[PDB]
From a paper:
The linear ubiquitin (Ub) chain assembly complex (LUBAC) generates Met1-linked “linear” Ub chains that regulate the activation of the nuclear factor κB (NFκB) transcription factor and other processes. (2006) identified the linear Ub chain assembly complex (LUBAC), which consists of the chain-assembling E3 ligase HOIP as well as HOIL-1 and SHARPIN (Walczak et al., 2012). HOIP also comprises several NPL4 zinc finger (NZF) Ub binding domains (UBDs) that target it to ubiquitinated proteins (Haas et al., 2009), a Ub-associated (UBA) domain that mediates interactions with HOIL-1 (Yagi et al., 2012), and N-terminal PUB (peptide:N-glycanase/UBA- or UBX-containing proteins) and B box domains of unknown functions. Here, we show that OTULIN interacts directly with the N-terminal PUB domain of HOIP via a conserved PUB-interacting motif (PIM) in OTULIN.
Our structure contains 13 molecules within the asymmetric unit that superimpose with a low root-mean-square deviation (rmsd; 0.9–1.2 Å). As anticipated, residues 59–158 of HOIP form a PUB domain resembling that of PNGase, the only other PUB domain structurally characterized to date (Allen et al., 2006; Zhao et al., 2007). HOIP and PNGase superimpose with an rmsd of 7.2 Å for residues 59–158 of HOIP, and most secondary structure elements are conserved. In addition, the HOIP PUB domain contains two N-terminal helices and one C-terminal helix that contribute to the hydrophobic core of the PUB domain, revealing why shorter constructs were insoluble. Hydrophobic residues within the N-terminal extension are conserved among most HOIP orthologs, suggesting that the extended fold is conserved. In contrast, the residues forming a putative PIM pocket are highly conserved in HOIP. The HOIP PIM pocket is formed by hydrophobic residues located on helices α4 (equivalent to helix α2 in PNGase, hereafter named αA) and α5 (equivalent to helix α3 in PNGase, hereafter named αB) and on the β1 strand (compare Figures 2B and 1E). In our apo structures, the side chain of Tyr94 is rotated to bind the HOIP Tyr pocket in cis, appearing to block access to the PIM pocket.
Author numbering: 2 to 183
Amino acid sequence: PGEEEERAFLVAREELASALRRDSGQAFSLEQLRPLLASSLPLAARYLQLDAARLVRCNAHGEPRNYLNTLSTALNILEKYGRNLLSPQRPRYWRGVKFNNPVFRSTVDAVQGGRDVLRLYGYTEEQPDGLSFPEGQEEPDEHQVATVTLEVLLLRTELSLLLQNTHPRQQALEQLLEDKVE
């Protein structure tokens, strides 16, 4: 991980976050994400907003095929919350998220630290049955939301590829989990 290796990564990371701001419903290809996937950087360096190591530590229980799927699905839902905040057609009820929502209960509530990601978006204040933005806040911090969404999108992409045995840096992640995803 040289200085020119850390430079290429920061740059693509800032650009991809900008891509989300322009089109929130936009889908990202594997080739589009690879500069952030195939980098030889420390885990704590790739995920600055997201605590990837803690997500693994608190959720890696049982078979890899199980908790990686539980994790990907949860991250997928969390990603959508972010995409919605950046969307031109944003729900009028965007200021809050309810934990007893059918999708949330079956996805995000299954993973430890799902609520922690929501606060990164801006859902910092405690509302009944969930989290919400402060009352005085007019709009989401689009740059903050774009940054978090990208990392959430990133981590899900890595976990998905692990299951597929197609990750460009597969060995490093299997050493993190200390188990092979068959």
